């Protein structure tokens, strides 16, 4: 009932259209948590387009 | 205000007479709690065990009453719980128990007293500061 | 973990070997007046 | 009236970046 | 005495929050750093004008010369920190500015805390606080070692008052 | 109906004698005797239903039953309170000096 | 053979109950004359759930795994305690004393810090009927008590507390007290919690059994700030009995 | 007593009570002035008047102490409550209203009769709206102030 | 929104670190 | 001409923008590691169990902070002094909780800013200097490693070493004040002489110069364009300076050594924190400041409060206050 | 947090408006030389 | 029926609803949406539904 679409969300639909899912704190948008993303969650997207 | 008399004078025992100690030995008494009791009793409090004070009146609880030098003088020598049911020299400083408290091996008996009387006589000094703690100081 | 463990003793091993080498290799005579 | 809080800033530098960026120009014009 | 006002002004007037103190604070640093920094570097880019290893005597206070590299000092400095002085006007310049707006910058606060005008609280932080007991910043942190030297000080300190705090009034922590 | 339960229980005997069943041990320390032996036994054999009671405790020499007749006066109890005898607080309550 | 202190320190090897070899299959008999004692009980974690809050109607929590912050600092030891034998010939463990408790936090997906305090305080744990033997079959349950998190001297980051502290907000000296009371006014929780010691390994010669278990109790409240959560506990445990 | 002179023996309009940075009206703070409750009179078990302490300007927050007409401690809300004497539960402290809104009321439980008690030290007690300006609780300075530090 | 602008202004003395190093006015002999 | 000596070269080059050196070598890394992770942990990292009892401290902007109270957090009392790297936790969840973060960012900055003063020699030898620029600078780092690392070492533990941050700065030193009386203490009274006397000395000389330069310029220009970049001539005339300063106080007291006037304006403030740092380093093993409590007494054995009294009636409210539910025994022996 | 909604104008002016000052003045001295 | 079905099945989470100045999430307008209150049948009088 609160997907990212009700909250404003814009990038993290194109992160999750291509594969990102989980959050270094392991949650995932499908709602299982407990994942581990490795490097390549949403977090460490955003770190990589930084550096 | 001074060291008069009044103050100098302190119960001798239970049966209610007293005696008056010079200033020589106050000064005297205070000189030897510094060297054999401070450590742990240093203001009239216990540092290792707080719940117990050398005020007058947690003194005059104890049983064998300490509230006198005969009492305090004894407590040196034979030192109990303050319900006097057991005898605790093996941990406190005492006569008894000066081989393995050496500081007490050089203490005579008018020390004693000299530690007695300087025990009665700083609260009338220092009032709630004595055996009060960190509050008072 | 110890990959991460691996990787750190690597790298300081590294650079602490360049800077015993580095000094090792003539310093005083890298200064501008008397090279010996 | 409960308008927008942010209504304020967005006014205010909506004014102020286009503006201080047409005076920057115009004074260094001056000065040439 | 004074190190009692010290000691007055945190746990009244939470002083060292106060951003007029904080610029005083760097103004004295930032003037005995600019002190050490402008005597050591002058006196390690001296110029070699004398034979002895006493640099002291090879000045003559008549002498027209600069006594030490404005140049190496520039270059040295510019490559160790990356940014030097170049000019020695500015330089002696400066040295007079900071630590004498640091200390009007504090005088000012001064003036305020003369009408308790305080920069003692957050607001925000003591909403949350109040509301979340489980909020802990070194903010709130200091504010209770405030609370301790007003309580544990103030009979002694201010005497006409009569403030008597019985033992179950003062704020303590457990066991001290 | 949020209320503070030590502050509650100041309002009743507990505040104003010791209560056998909630009082930390060093207020044993106000009357002659009763430190640290009987003291002891007192806070081990809690609760109490009657300051009476207490004069059951097994193994009371007769010179401690006396003495704890001397006292019964300076005794109330209360209902327990989880907040005073949890922790081990009736043995050390953090308070010294 | 056995480890000296040197042997262990550092190694996290104190936090480990002690283990039975697998060969351990046999049988404690119990004499319903005699009298026993639980020498040692040893409950070592290994897992934290926690219950989530399912938000919709009719959906109810999911238990989740957790994450440990607090290191190897969990195991209870040294319990012991009477083991009776009842009219029925159940056994019943009373526990007297040990190191009955650990605070532990684990963390959530999302961050949240979860406190809790991991006890068997006060354990009663009774068997089934008709032991007679102690078995790799043989289940313990019982119930304990959960005491407060936080005891009643401690002070929150603006001083409050039950048995010490502020009872307001006084940096707010004006505000409105109705809306802080449930942070103003600490209470001293008690509840209490559920455990299951499932035995499997059995030494008949020297008393000691081994096993698994399964508890459930509740987290922190913060002294009434705010809801606890569920906590499920898996582990391993060690028992010593003797003849007392 | 007018409402007016009451409001004035009340430290919240005092102009040393403020802060560099809370800023707006003073009403933002300790809120809107709506009435005078009354005068709060504290009495013990035994029928003595008791008088709060009032806070001093120097401090930001103040306990609660009670005393007698000749200065005497009978009565404040403990910190450590292990040892405490002076309880409002020990001492059967009650408060009585005269004047103002509570005129004639009587209040005995204790943490009612503390919560006044912690209004007390401000002087005069008052009713605030606070909603209004959601005011935050915090006291505020006045134009004497603010005009006093920026002329200075 | 706090946050941000904290961190932004931390960002903008670091890029202006940048600028006062490698292109600061240089000092040229006389 | 060799791949090594190429290097060499380049490491050594007097022609780097920024000069590198050997020092460099390992300076450049360890304070990289420190400020990122610093930088990280300041805007992000979660609360920090500080005192060891599961009583976490938010440090962070994104968890309530602003920059005034923002920092990032001692490491557990319960680690003590024990070494906790990101390899020696379970998760970076628990790293994270126990203050890892602190004890990475301090030790790189130790090691990189003691190749910093390092490095301060290195450029001194390559450009033919005299070598004590880096003398200077071991005051502010003995400093540092005072209350970053030495007076932990001494109390136990680097929890009570000093936050990295404002307000945390602020908490150290209120309870370094009651645990150890540090005003008291004869040597932060020197550093003090030495901050204060620095501060002094530094705006007397800056305005004595300012004072004596030379007129090279108009009124409609800054007089600072009067002095151009490596001029062989003096651009003021301390000749001028030295005749007003001494007969402001008398002859023999001002300076017409420059040499010795700028050696002056180097030693004080240099060594009145040398002293500080000293003091911090000192009390680190509790040789604390001087105790006049109940020193005067009258006739009969009243004591008189003095001001020393005074300081220690706050003292006990910042003792009897701090971590306050962190003690269970009477005395806070560290 | 709860904090002052007009602290984000109050500090975006404070650094704009006294920053567009400088830059202007020293832009214009650019272009004289 | 699931909640998520039910939820698409509301003219709120039509994208040709909003505003071009009424800014934000979703969440702004409506609210959260926090349950399903269920399936709505109107009948009148005479036991006849209506839609
Ligand atoms: C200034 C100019 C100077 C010029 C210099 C030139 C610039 C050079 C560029 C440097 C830029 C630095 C960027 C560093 C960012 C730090 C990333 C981080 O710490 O990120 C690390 C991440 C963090 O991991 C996740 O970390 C999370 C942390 O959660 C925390 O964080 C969350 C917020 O994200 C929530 O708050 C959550 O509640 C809280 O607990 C969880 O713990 C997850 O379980 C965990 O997976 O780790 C991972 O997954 C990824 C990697 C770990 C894989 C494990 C294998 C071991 C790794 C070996 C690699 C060593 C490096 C190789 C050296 C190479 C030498 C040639
Ligand atoms: C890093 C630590 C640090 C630093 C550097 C400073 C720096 C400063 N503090 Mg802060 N302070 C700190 C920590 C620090 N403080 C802490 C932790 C506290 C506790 C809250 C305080 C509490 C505090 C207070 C309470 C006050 C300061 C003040 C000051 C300023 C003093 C200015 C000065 O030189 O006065 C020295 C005095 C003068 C310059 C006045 C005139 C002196 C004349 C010329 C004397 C001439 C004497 C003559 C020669 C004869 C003497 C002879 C005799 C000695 C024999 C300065 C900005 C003061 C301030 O802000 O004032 C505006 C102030 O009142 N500070
Ligand atoms: C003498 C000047 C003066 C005085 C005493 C007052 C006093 C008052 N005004 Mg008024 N006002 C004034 C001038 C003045 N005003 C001017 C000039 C304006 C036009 C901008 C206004 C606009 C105005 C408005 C819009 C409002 C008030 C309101 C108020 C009240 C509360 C103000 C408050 O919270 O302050 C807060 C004060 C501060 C936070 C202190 C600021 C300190 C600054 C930041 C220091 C800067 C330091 C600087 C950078 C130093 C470094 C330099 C160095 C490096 C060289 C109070 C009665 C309010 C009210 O209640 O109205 C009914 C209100 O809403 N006033
Ligand atoms: C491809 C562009 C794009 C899109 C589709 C979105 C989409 C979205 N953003 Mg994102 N965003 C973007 C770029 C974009 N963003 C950029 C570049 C930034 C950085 C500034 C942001 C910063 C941002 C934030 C901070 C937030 C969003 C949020 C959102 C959501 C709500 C948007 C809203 O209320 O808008 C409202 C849109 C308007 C009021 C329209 C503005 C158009 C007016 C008419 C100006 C144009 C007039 C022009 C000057 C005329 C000149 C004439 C002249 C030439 C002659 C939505 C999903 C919000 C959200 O929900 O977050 C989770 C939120 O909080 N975005
Ligand atoms: C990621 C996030 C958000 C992190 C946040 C981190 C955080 C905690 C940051 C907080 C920052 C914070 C708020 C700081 C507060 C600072 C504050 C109080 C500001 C003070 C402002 C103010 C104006 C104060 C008034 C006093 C004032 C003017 C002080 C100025 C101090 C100052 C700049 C002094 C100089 C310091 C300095 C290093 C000088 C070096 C000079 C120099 C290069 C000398 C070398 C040199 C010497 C020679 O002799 C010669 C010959 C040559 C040639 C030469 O070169
Ligand atoms: C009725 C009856 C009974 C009453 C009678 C009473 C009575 C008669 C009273 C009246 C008394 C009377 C008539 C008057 C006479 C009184 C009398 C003369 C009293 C003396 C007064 C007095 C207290 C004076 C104050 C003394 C004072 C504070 C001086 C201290 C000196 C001092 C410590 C100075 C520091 C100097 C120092 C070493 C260096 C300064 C720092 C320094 C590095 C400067 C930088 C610098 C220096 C240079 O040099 C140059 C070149 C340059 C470039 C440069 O950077
Ligand atoms: C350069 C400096 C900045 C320039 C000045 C600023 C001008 C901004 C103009 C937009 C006005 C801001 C809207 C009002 C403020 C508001 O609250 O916004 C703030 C809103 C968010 O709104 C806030 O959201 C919050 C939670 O995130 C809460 O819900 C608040 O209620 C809500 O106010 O953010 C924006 O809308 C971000 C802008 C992204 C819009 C991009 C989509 C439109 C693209 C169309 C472009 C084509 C036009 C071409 C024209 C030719
Ligand atoms: C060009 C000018 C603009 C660029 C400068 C940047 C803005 C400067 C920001 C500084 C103002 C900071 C005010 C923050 C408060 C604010 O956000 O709340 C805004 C506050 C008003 O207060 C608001 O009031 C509301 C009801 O009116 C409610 O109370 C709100 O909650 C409250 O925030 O603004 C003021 O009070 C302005 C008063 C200005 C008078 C102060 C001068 C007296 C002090 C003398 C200072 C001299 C010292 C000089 C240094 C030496
Ligand atoms: C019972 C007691 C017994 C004694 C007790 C023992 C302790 C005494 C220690 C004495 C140590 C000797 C120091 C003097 C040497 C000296 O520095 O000369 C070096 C130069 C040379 O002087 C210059 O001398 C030059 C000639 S020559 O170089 O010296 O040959 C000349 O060129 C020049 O003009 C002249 O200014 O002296 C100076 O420039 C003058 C200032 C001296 C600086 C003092 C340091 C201050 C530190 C205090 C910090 C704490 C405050 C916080
Ligand atoms: C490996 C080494 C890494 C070192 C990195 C350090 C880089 C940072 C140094 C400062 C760069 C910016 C200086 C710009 C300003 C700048 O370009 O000044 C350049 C200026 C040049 O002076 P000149 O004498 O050439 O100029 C005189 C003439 O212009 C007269 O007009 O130097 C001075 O003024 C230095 C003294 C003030 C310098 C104080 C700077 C230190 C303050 C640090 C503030 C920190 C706040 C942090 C908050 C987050
Ligand atoms: C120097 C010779 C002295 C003297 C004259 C006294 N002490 Fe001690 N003291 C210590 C402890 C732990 C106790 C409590 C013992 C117990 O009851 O369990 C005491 C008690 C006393 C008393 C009785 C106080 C009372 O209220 O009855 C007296 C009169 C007394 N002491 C005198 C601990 C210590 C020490 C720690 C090593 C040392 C040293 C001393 N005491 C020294 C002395
Ligand atoms: O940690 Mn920080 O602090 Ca140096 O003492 Mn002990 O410990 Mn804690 O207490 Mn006081
Ligand atoms: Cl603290
Ligand atoms: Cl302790
Ligand atoms: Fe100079």
């Keep these: 009932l609160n997907p990212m679409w009700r909250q404003g969300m814009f990038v993290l639909p194109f992160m999750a259209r291509l594969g990102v899912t989980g959050s270094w704190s392991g949650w995932s948008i499908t709602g299982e948590t407990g994942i581990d993303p490795g490097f390549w969650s949403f977090e460490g997207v955003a770190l990589a387009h930084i550096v | 205000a001074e060291l008069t008399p009044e103050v100098l004078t302190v119960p001798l025992n239970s049966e209610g007479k007293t005696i008056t100690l010079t200033e020589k030995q106050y000064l005297e008494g205070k000189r ?34 300490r509230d006198n030098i005969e009492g305090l003088v004894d407590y040196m020598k034979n030192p109990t719980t303050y319900d006097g049911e057991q005898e605790i020299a093996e941990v406190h400083p005492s006569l008894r128990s000066a081989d393995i408290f050496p500081k007490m091996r050089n203490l005579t008996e008018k020390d004693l007293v000299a530690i007695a009387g300087h025990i009665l006589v700083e609260p009338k000094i220092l009032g709630d500061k004595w055996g009060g703690g960190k509050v008072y100081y | 973990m110890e990959t991460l463990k691996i990787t750190v003793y690597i790298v300081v091993t590294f650079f602490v070997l360049l800077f015993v080498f580095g000094f090792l290799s003539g310093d005083p005579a890298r200064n501008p007046k008397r090279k010996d | 009236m409960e308008v927008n809080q942010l209504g304020l800033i967005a006014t205010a530098l909506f004014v102020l970046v286009p503006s201080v960026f047409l005076i920057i120009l115009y004074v260094q014009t001056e000065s040439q | 005495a004074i190190f009692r006002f010290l000691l007055f002004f945190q746990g009244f007037h939470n002083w060292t929050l106060n951003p007029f103190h904080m610029m005083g604070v760097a103004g004295v640093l930032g003037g005995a ?25 090879a000045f003559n206070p008549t002498q027209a010369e600069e006594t030490y590299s404005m140049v190496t000092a520039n270059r040295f400095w510019s490559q160790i920190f990356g940014i030097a002085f170049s000019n020695k006007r500015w330089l002696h310049f400066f040295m007079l500015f900071v630590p004498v707006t640091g200390l009007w910058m504090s005088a000012i606060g001064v003036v305020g805390l003369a009408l308790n005008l305080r920069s003692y609280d957050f607001i925000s932080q003591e909403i949350r606080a109040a509301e979340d007991p489980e909020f802990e910043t070194f903010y709130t942190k200091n504010l209770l070692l405030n609370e301790g030297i007003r309580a544990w000080m103030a009979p002694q300190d201010q005497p006409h008052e009569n403030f008597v705090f019985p033992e179950e009034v003062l704020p303590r922590g457990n066991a001290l | 109906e949020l209320v503070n339960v030590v502050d509650e229980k100041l309002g009743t005997a507990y505040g104003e004698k010791i209560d056998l069943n909630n009082t930390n041990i060093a207020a044993f320390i106000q009357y002659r005797g009763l430190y640290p032996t009987l003291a002891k036994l007192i806070v081990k054999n809690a609760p109490y239903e009657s300051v009476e009671d207490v004069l059951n405790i097994p193994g009371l020499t007769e010179r401690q039953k006396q003495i704890l007749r001397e006292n019964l006066e300076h005794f109330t109890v209360t209902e327990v309170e989880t907040a005073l005898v949890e922790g081990g607080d009736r043995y050390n309550n953090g308070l010294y000096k | 053979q056995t480890l000296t202190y040197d042997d262990i320190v550092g190694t996290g090897l104190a936090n480990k109950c002690p283990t039975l070899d697998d060969t351990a299959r046999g049988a404690y008999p119990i004499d319903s004359s005699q009298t026993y004692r639980i020498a040692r009980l040893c409950l070592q974690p290994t897992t934290f759930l926690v219950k989530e809050e399912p938000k919709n109607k009719r959906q109810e929590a999911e238990f989740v795994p957790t994450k440990l912050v ?81 005891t009643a001297n401690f002070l929150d980051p603006k001083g409050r507390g039950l048995a010490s502290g502020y009872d307001s907000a006084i940096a707010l000296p004006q505000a409105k007290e109705e809306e802080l009371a449930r942070a103003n006014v600490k209470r001293f929780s008690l509840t209490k919690g559920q455990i299951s010691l499932n035995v499997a390994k059995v030494d008949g010669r020297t008393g000691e059994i081994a096993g698994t278990f399964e508890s459930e109790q509740l987290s922190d409240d913060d002294m009434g700030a705010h809801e606890p959560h569920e906590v499920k506990i898996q582990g391993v445990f060690y028992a010593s009995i003797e003849p007392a | 007593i007018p409402e007016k002179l009451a409001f004035y023996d009340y430290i919240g309009n005092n102009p040393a009570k403020g802060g560099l940075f809370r800023t707006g009206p003073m009403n933002k703070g300790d809120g809107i002035a709506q009435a005078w409750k009354g005068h709060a009179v504290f009495r013990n078990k035994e029928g003595e008047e008791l008088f709060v302490r009032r806070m001093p300007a120097f401090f930001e927050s103040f306990p609660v102490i009670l005393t007698d007409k000749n200065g005497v401690v009978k009565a404040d809300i403990p910190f450590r409550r292990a040892e405490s004497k002076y309880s409002f539960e020990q001492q059967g402290v009650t408060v009585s209203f005269y004047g103002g809104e509570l005129n004639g009321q009587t209040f005995t439980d204790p943490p009612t009769v503390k919560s006044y008690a912690r209004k007390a030290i401000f002087g005069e007690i008052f009713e605030f709206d606070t909603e209004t300006l959601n005011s935050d609780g915090i006291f505020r300075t006045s134009p004497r102030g603010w005009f006093t530090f920026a002329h200075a | 929104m706090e946050t941000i602008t904290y961190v932004f202004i931390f960002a903008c003395i670091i890029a202006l670190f940048f600028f006062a190093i490698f292109f600061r006015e240089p000092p040229r002999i006389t | 001409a ?46 920090v169990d500080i005192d060891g009892i599961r009583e976490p401290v938010s440090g962070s902007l994104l968890y309530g902070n602003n920059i005034i109270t923002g920092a990032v957090v001692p490491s557990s009392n319960a680690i003590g002094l024990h070494f906790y790297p990101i390899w ?115 705006a007397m000389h800056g305005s004595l110069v300012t004072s004596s330069l030379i007129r090279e310029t108009t009124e409609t220009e800054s007089a600072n364009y009067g002095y151009k970049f490596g001029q062989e001539e003096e651009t003021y005339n301390i000749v001028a300076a030295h005749g007003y300063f001494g007969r402001l106080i008398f002859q023999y007291a001002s300076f017409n050594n420059s040499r010795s006037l700028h050696f002056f304006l180097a030693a004080w403030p240099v060594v009145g924190v040398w002293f500080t740092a000293l003091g911090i380093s000192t009390m680190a093993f509790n040789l604390n400041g001087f105790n006049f409590n109940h020193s005067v007494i009258d006739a009969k054995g009243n004591v008189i409060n003095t001001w020393a009294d005074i300081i220690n009636r706050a003292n006990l409210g910042m003792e009897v206050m701090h971590e306050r539910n962190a003690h269970n025994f009477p005395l806070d022996l560290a």
């Design chain 2, 32 to 65: 030897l709690f510094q060297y054999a009791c401070a450590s742990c009793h240093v203001g009239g409090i216990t540092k290792t065990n707080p719940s117990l004070d050398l005020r007058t009146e947690t003194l005059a609880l104890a049983t064998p009453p």
């Design chain 5, 33 to 57: 750093l600019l002190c050490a920094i402008h005597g050591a570097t002058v006196e390690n880019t001296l110029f070699q004008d004398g034979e002895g290893a006493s640099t002291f005597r």
């Design chain 7, 70 to 150: 607090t290191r190897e600092t969990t195991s209870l030891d040294q319990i012991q305690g009477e083991l009776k034998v009842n009219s029925d010939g159940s056994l019943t463990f009373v526990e007297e004393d040990g190191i009955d408790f650990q605070p532990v936090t684990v963390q959530m997906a999302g961050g949240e810090r979860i406190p809790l305090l991991f006890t068997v305080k006060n354990l009663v744990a009774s068997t089934q009927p008709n032991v007679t033997s102690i078995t790799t079959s043989t289940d313990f349950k019982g119930e304990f008590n959960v005491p407060s998190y936080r």
């Design chain 10, 2 to 47: 060799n791949l090594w000596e190429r290097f060499c070269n380049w490491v050594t080059s007097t022609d780097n923008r920024l000069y590198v050196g050997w020092f460099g070598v390992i300076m450049i890394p360890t304070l990289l590691a420190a400020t990122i992770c610093f930088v990280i942990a300041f805007i992000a990292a979660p609360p």
């Design chain 10, 88 to 202: 020696e936790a379970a998760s970076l969840d628990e790293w994270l909780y126990n203050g890892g973060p602190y004890q990475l960012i301090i030790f790189h900055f130790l090691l990189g800013a003691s190749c910093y003063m390092g490095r301060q020699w290195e450029l001194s030898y390559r450009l033919g200097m005299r070598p004590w620029i880096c003398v200077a600078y071991s005051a502010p780092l003995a400093s540092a490693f005072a209350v970053f690392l030495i007076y932990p070492i001494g109390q136990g533990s680097f929890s009570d070493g000093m936050p990295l941050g404002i307000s945390g700065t602020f908490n150290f030193m209120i309870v370094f004040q009651a645990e150890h009386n540090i005003l008291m203490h004869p040597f932060h009274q020197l550093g003090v002489a030495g901050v204060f006397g620095g501060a002094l000395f530094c």
